[PDB]
Structure 1
């Protein structure tokens, strides 16, 4: 039995493109990713996801929808990362670079998998098919998956 810490991840997914951010520092630096971070005390998970989206990309959205949950375990770390993944297609402003992230749009036939976390190759296709998922990935370091589970679910 391990304890887990709550994190969010937000994908701005439009009909032909997705917004990703190049992580400029910290965890997963150097990889394109959705926007997110630790959930803070008192806020709902969804509101924490909205907050991190605004902080990291400048975008303000009224609502998100839950699309998945991924649990990450790292060799040598007792604490699991419980990542709650959200989408929206509805935005109303322009992305702006923050200290954490440089946003960039990618066409949906140019998803930059080689420059994303390795696990994204497994679950991101489900997100694109509008399927809900639960995943678990155990990493050695940043690059090597030792064990994983991925399942489509009807509710997140």
Structure 2
């Protein structure tokens, strides 16, 4: 039948030559995992404006964003998909702050904390680091198990 309906999300990676800024999600779904900053796009908002807003709300940073990929997530037992538009920037001009949602830390690019990131990151995060654009899809059973995935460079 028809592909499930999807909700629009953004995800922003602050990626400098030697390090990346990640946030530890403090509560809710996926709490305890490190990742980029993002959330739901709001009604009438452009995707890039939503990405800037989520970066500011979750990390305090105000920034040019570059579109780097799109990843669709499906969870067993939930008919609605997450359609995540991924962005990255190298240029910041303020300091990240802990928010209600996220605790920030910088990681060197030889210390990407995959053990404490979502399992899908092993597949697409390396493409982001190589500046290669991508489209991916991941079906999860719960928070740990991937039952199916597709990934391509574009």
Q: Structure 1 length normalisation: TM-score? A: 0.96
Deviations 1:81-102 (A, max 9, x none): 0000000001100000000000
Distance across 2 between alignment mates of 1:149 and 1:49: 24
**Offset at 1:49?**
0.4
Cα distance in 1 for partners of 2:114, 2:4 equals 29
What secondary structure does 2:128 align onto? helix
Give aligned pairs, total.
Answer: 152
Report the Cα distance in structure 2 between the residues aligned to 1:26 and 1:88, rounded to whole angstroms: 26
**Distance in 1 of aligned mates of 2:129 and 2:14:** 11
Offset at residue 112 of structure 1 (A): 0.1
Paired with 1:29 and 1:37, the residues of 2 have a C-alpha distance of: 14
* Structure 2 gap segments, 5+ residues each: none
SS at match of 1:79: strand
Aligned mates of 2:106, 2:91 — CA distance in 1: 15
> 1:28, CA displacement in angstroms?
1.3
Secondary structure of the corresponding residue to residue 30 of structure 1: coil
**C-alpha distance after superposition, 1:73-128 (max 9, x if no partner):** 00000000000000000110000000000010000000000000000000000000
Whole-angstrom CA distance in 2 between matches of 1:53 and 1:103: 12
What is the TM-score of this pair, normalised by structure 2? Answer: 0.97
Shift in Å, 1:149: 0.3
Structure 1 partner of 2:118 = 117
Alpha-carbon separation, structure 1, partners of 2:16 and 2:27: 26
1:99 corresponding residue in structure 2? 100
Alignment partner of 1:32 is 2:3:
no
Q: CA deviation at 1:22?
A: 0.4
> Alignment partner for residue 47 of structure 2, among 45, 48, 70?
45
